[PDB]
Write a structure and sequence with these properties.
The PDB classes it as odorant-binding protein. The entry lists the keywords Odorant Binding Protein, Odorant-Binding Protein. The chain is an all-alpha fold. It has one domain (12-118): Recoverin, domain 1, CATH 1.10.238.20. The protein is built from six helices and no strands. The chain has helices spanning 13-30, 34-42, 49-61, 73-78, 85-92, 103-117. It is globular and about 30 Å long. The two termini are 22 Å apart. The chain binds 6-methylhept-5-en-2-one (0VT). Residues 73, 76-77, 80, 88-89, 91-93, 114 line the site of 6-methylhept-5-en-2-one.
């Protein structure tokens, strides 16, 4: 079952809420559209270069990157609500080592990898 779970409990409302202002900042900086974000979240993987940098911006704004701006997966896992701890771990267990030239490339690589592993529970806002 690969259909996206979207209800009052999941994605966690408190997480969506905390991310919203970061979304406003990162959408403003990169010029990505809302539609591009929703389509990646809920339908099919697609390559939009501004979406990739939006994704990178979100990791930075969320303070889950190391000193070189790379995603620090332990910090990301700790920043998630406890209720999604196990799902996120299985979703990321074969996505440990991102490939790509730029920080935007590696951020896209991760998101794509998480979405392929568990498209029901994967989301982007
Ligand atoms: C937080 C997430 O989505 C992936 C984390 C992956 C680990 C801890 C192996």
């Amino acid at each position: 079952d690969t259909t996206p779970r979207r209800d009052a409990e999941y994605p966690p409302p408190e997480l969506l809420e905390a991310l919203k202002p970061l979304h406003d900042i990162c959408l403003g900086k990169t010029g990505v559209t809302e539609e591009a974000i929703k389509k990646f979240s809920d339908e099919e993987i697609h390559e939009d270069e501004k979406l990739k940098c939006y994704m990178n911006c979100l990791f930075h704004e969320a303070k889950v990157v190391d000193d070189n701006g790379d995603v620090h997966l332990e910090k990301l896992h700790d920043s998630l609500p406890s209720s999604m701890h196990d799902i996120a771990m299985h979703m990321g267990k074969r996505c440990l080592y991102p490939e790509g030239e730029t920080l935007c490339d590696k951020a896209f690589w991760l998101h794509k990898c998480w979405k392929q592993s568990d498209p029901k529970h994967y989301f982007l806002v």
